[PDB]
Scaffold this motif. Structure first.
Motif, PDB file in Angstrom:
ATOM      1  N   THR A 193      -2.351   5.579  -3.518  1.00  0.00           N
ATOM      2  CA  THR A 193      -1.914   6.294  -2.317  1.00  0.00           C
ATOM      3  C   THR A 193      -0.606   5.686  -1.787  1.00  0.00           C
ATOM      4  N   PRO A 194       0.492   5.785  -2.561  1.00  0.00           N
ATOM      5  CA  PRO A 194       1.796   5.236  -2.167  1.00  0.00           C
ATOM      6  C   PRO A 194       2.410   5.795  -0.874  1.00  0.00           C
ATOM      7  N   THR A 242       0.381   6.460   1.840  1.00  0.00           N
ATOM      8  CA  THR A 242      -0.616   6.183   2.864  1.00  0.00           C
ATOM      9  C   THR A 242      -0.834   4.682   3.060  1.00  0.00           C
ATOM     10  N   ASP A 271      -3.061   2.498   3.759  1.00  0.00           N
ATOM     11  CA  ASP A 271      -4.495   2.255   3.779  1.00  0.00           C
ATOM     12  C   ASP A 271      -4.823   0.971   3.027  1.00  0.00           C
ATOM     13  N   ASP A 293      -0.486   1.319  -5.705  1.00  0.00           N
ATOM     14  CA  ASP A 293      -1.841   1.817  -5.484  1.00  0.00           C
ATOM     15  C   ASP A 293      -1.836   3.334  -5.581  1.00  0.00           C
ATOM     16  N   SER A 340       0.837  -1.198   0.000  1.00  0.00           N
ATOM     17  CA  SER A 340       0.000   0.000   0.000  1.00  0.00           C
ATOM     18  C   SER A 340       0.876   1.253   0.000  1.00  0.00           C
ATOM     19  N   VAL A 341       2.150   1.087   0.340  1.00  0.00           N
ATOM     20  CA  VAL A 341       3.125   2.182   0.365  1.00  0.00           C
ATOM     21  C   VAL A 341       4.368   1.685  -0.390  1.00  0.00           C
TER      22      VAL A 341
END
Ligand code: HEM
Ligand SMILES: *[C@@H]1O[C@H](CO)[C@@H](O[C@@H]2O[C@H](CO)[C@@H](O)[C@H](O)[C@H]2NC(C)=O)[C@H](O)[C@H]1NC(C)=O
Ligand SMILES: [Ca+2]
Ligand SMILES: [Ca+2]
Length: 357
Positions: free
Chosen positions: A193-194, A196, A198, A191, A174-175
């Motif tokens: 939101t690299p 974050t 989440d 994703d 996710s990061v």
């Protein structure tokens, strides 16, 4: 105990990690879930996974700092391509904070890097790992072109990880971004939101692929749902392994179970990391220095959302026994570009030291 900075710690041995955390933040992370942080987090995994029950101790020692102690060996295995940069960034700290073993340094640095990512859990941190080990053998690192069966066997052989724990660890994607998969493009995020921690990755891998962020013929890569890029803002990339784990009968429901389940994801990841961090050691012989790990950044509390230009009709569901949550879609006619820098800018080079790897 009370450390020279008045900080009351659990054990005196944990005091040394205090100055190390501040040095890492000031020197390479700058309190951000950026490039340098991402690379260190990956090293934590590559260092730990190199161990094998069946092959025995001679194959590798797990979370032993072998990557730092033998820089010209493992970092050069094709599966470790790109890891050289993080090894070279950490060596200076090994030399400076010389009361801390290479092994401890690797794990702690990972815990510190992660704390900079909003939504991330405060990882457990045990210290006391020896400063001597051996260089690991090639073939112990999972690759993107591997089959689900192969990936699961590898993790099982490494430390008895169950399919649930394996998928839990993938929360780190996710990061995460890719620099070596496609040599024509850099920093392709997994994703939208690299920066974050989440559940977007779990949702976005389930969408239909429409194109490729760079070239279309790369080993271990499959079509992406958000390929559009411009300048430094590279489009989203999708790994065959992630795609495969999201659709295999053994892991399909586990994967879907994390969509829009922030607390469940974070807790599950913390548990899995708890095991990974001590591979090659008896946890009863390590001291608990968890209280010295920085408090992680809080998320905003917002639920997962379909990024602009995608919706429920684009889902490729595979778990027959669980209802997919109702999520909203971010407004917009076309895909939004995924920012290259955490501050929205398109220019933000991370600190990089030259070294032996
Ligand atoms: C299930 C097996 C896994 C496979 C096949 C895999 C594969 C990959 C690949 C191909 C990349 C791109 C590297 C590049 O070209 O720069 C990547 C990046 C990354 N992976 Fe994994 N991964 C796996 C498991 C994990 C786990 C368990 C962690 C947990 C710490 C992890 C953390 C990362 C991070 C943080 C990055 C991004 C590094 C960066 O942004 O520079 N991966 N992974
Ligand atoms: C762990 O082993 C490493 C590898 O030998 C040690 O690294 C050396 O540390 C000294 C300072 O104590 C530096 O001058 C050397 O340059 C380092 N060597 C290398 C190759 O970088 C480290 O000191 C050891 N740490 C502990 C706690 O035993
Ligand atoms: Ca190792
Ligand atoms: Ca994310």
């Amino acid at each position: 105990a009370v450390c020279p900075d008045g900080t009351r710690v659990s054990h005196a041995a944990c005091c040394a990690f205090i100055p190390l955390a501040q040095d890492l933040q000031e020197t390479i992370f700058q309190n951000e879930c950026g490039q340098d942080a991402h690379e260190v987090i990956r090293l934590t995994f590559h260092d730990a996974i190199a161990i094998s029950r069946s092959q025995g101790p001679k194959a590798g020692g797990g979370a032993d700092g072998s990557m730092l102690l033998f820089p010209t060996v493992e970092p050069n295995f094709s599966a470790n391509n790109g890891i050289d940069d993080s090894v070279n960034n950490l060596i200076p700290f090994m030399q400076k904070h010389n009361t801390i073993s290479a092994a401890d340094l690797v794990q702690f640095a990972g815990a510190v890097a992660l704390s900079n990512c909003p939504g991330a859990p405060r990882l457990e941190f045990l210290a006391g790992r020896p400063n001597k080990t051996i260089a690991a053998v090639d073939g112990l690192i999972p690759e993107p072109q591997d089959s689900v069966t192969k990936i699961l066997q590898r993790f099982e052989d490494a430390g008895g990880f169950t399919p649930f724990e394996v998928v839990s660890l993938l929360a780190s994607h996710s990061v995460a971004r890719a620099n070596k998969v496609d040599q024509t493009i850099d920093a392709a995020p997994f994703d939208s939101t690299p920066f974050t921690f989440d559940t977007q990755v779990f949702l976005e891998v389930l969408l239909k692929g429409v194109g490729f962020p760079g070239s279309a013929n790369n080993t271990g890569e499959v079509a992406s749902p958000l390929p559009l890029g411009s300048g430094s803002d590279t489009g989203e990339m999708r790994l065959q392994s992630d795609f495969a784990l999201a659709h295999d009968p053994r892991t399909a429901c586990i994967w879907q179970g994390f969509v829009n389940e922030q607390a469940f994801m974070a807790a599950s990841f913390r548990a899995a990391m708890s095991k990974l961090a001590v591979l090659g050691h008896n946890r009863n012989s390590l001291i608990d220095c968890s209280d010295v790990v920085p408090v992680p950044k809080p998320a905003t509390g917002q639920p997962a959302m379909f990024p602009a230009s995608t919706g429920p009709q684009d889902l490729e569901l595979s778990c027959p026994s669980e209802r997919f949550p109702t999520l909203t879609t971010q407004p917009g006619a076309s895909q939004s570009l995924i920012a290259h820098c955490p501050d929205g800018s398109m220019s933000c080079p991370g600190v990089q030291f030259n070294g032996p790897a």
